[PDB]
Symmetry: D2
């Protein structure tokens, strides 16, 4: 069957839900959240945050990177924002992220190296900041955290968002991170709602300042 195993672990699943409710999911209304995360899908957005599936609309690229010009992601955002009128977008880094570890420790990898230059660009812009944590684990954490913020800086700079605020659509964009280790999910005091941007982030970034 090639994946006999999986279709098996599946009819197994479908059984486990006697609560005749797949009907309930298929009747679930719009999502009110966009979650951008790492392909290292350690834990599913909803599950973490304790929501029903699909209550969260979801993108996943290596290292939850938002490129100014990556139409893969922007398409996901124009859709979620303009058409599902979600209330909150949120970039979510995760501690122990392979993308960030591979880039931090300038490890050659092949093609994705090119995408991770986007994360190495954050290492650059906060080089100074990252020194006064002379370690590994300390930096690593601080890097994946600052990743999640400069990603939000990227969202909020997208035309889509500016245009959505411009036309008076209520919306807010969070820099957020969660530990596969403890489950526990860190607010970064990064959550933008109009373009009072410079202010709301300096804050978030200063809450490293060794």
């Amino acid at each position: 069957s090639h994946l006999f195993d999986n279709n098996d672990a599946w009819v197994k699943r479908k059984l486990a839900d006697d609560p005749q409710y797949f009907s309930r999911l298929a009747d679930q209304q719009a999502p009110e959240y966009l979650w951008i995360g790492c392909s290292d899908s350690r834990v599913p957005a909803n599950q973490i945050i304790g929501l029903p599936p699909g209550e969260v609309f979801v993108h996943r690229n290596i290292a939850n990177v938002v490129v100014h010009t990556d139409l893969n992601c922007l398409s996901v955002i124009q859709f979620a924002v303009d058409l599902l009128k979600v209330k909150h977008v949120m970039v979510v880094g995760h501690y122990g992220c392979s993308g960030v570890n591979a880039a931090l420790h300038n490890r050659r990898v092949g093609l994705a190296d090119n995408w991770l230059h986007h994360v190495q660009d954050v290492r650059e812009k906060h080089a100074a900041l990252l020194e006064d944590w002379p370690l590994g684990e300390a930096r690593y954490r601080r890097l994946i955290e600052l990743n999640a913020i400069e990603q939000v800086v990227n969202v909020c700079r997208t035309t889509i968002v500016n245009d959505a605020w411009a036309r008076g659509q209520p919306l807010t964009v969070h820099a957020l991170v969660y530990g596969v280790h403890d489950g526990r999910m860190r607010n970064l005091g990064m959550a933008v709602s109009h373009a009072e941007q410079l202010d709301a982030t300096y804050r978030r970034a200063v809450a490293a300042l060794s």
Copy 2:
């Protein structure tokens, strides 16, 4: 708190797992599966297929589209393939997918319209096929199904994959679909392992042929 609610529904979650095992996830080894899916993350890859989280490495774009040139996805694939040496890649469409419905019913949407031209391109190439299902629900289904295959045709045409076969890395790429309605997950008889491509797909596509 802005999302007080969510951090609440979270410490709630973390409690629910007394089985002191977050340790078990943080110790989880490489994934052996890449799952490309719709941002319409109705259900999390693992959960469906009944696996632990992170056992499945995951990308999500609107309409589980693989572009020949979308480095957002390719980066995800070079990584998963070349570096996590996953055994199986699988594109997974889902019935009732908003991306496919929006494109099928040539609905103006804004920017994502441009990304969905990739799905309208599948509507074109199988125009003939899609007629002899003169309906809606019948087509819609048949379209999202054929989406998942021509996406696999796109993966298998990527340099990454050809190069991985070329250097004798065992790997296989499945066209797959699942119903939010029933949970049940359809094999499409689309699962490629060397470039005997033309053969293995004609098959899969012919299993529509009204």
Copy 3:
């Protein structure tokens, strides 16, 4: 100097223009043409068409490919269209194009292979057509010609364009090709102005029909 030679062949150039007129170019008004062409910049857009430089606003990618989702090109088009209100956009293939020859003769090349899958996709969709020219030179030509058209089909499907027609901006998009061999530049009877698309192209494509 590393390129001493070039800065030399340059002060040489600047001399050659006594007609104190660089002033004339720096005072040149908006372009009224967008020209998408092959990086194989055999001949500069303007020169061919006998215009002053900059009278033509210009993009160049391998094989004058327009991707539905390539923001490199779309950015160039939104700019040229929306902001320089150019009257005519035109995709221009060229005979003996390395991109098309490399893809036609399924030659492994490395990364660009992935971009040329876009040209191999045109080879696919007109496979039938391309057979009844059982040769090489005949096909090759016919392929690079059909490239230039399905590229125009891609432009005209872009939101940018539809939106520009929608808001009553006069604009028209030509499928065009030129021979490095003879200089002479072929009209393809492919030049769209509203979305009477299906009509205006069938035409252009039928003018192969061996």
Copy 4:
């Protein structure tokens, strides 16, 4: 004819070359230069530098931007480098570039705005530097100049290039700029050949330092 005018200004051109030599261009060997430039194709790469056409292989995007992940450009570079074994790649900004002026003077434009965030990112990283030129013309110039360098920093960070040096292919990448005003073409003392990168650029950047 729609463009009767252009096909006219063309048979006009082809005449003007009695020197029966289109044959000479069609027999022209590989290019030894890649030139990345602004779509604002004020002047054709070759012409400036006083070379025959096609002696220069050419990309053009708004503001001669190199994205880490823009496969439109990277494809052009892998091709030029790996397959035409060009000796020198060179990013070329131009004074009075619309892309840079539009972004510098944070002018809303539509979609290209998103691509120009790449140029606004250079404005950010050298914010300090750009202040001590309290003007307009002075900054503008200094910005388009620094654009051309951080673009080269982007090329040289591409896998393609590192891999080409790694396998002992002789190659060198110049930050370069030219004035539509005077024709004259500025060396920036930015021309990298191995990854002694940090050194060779600090230099180039310091030659602003008001």
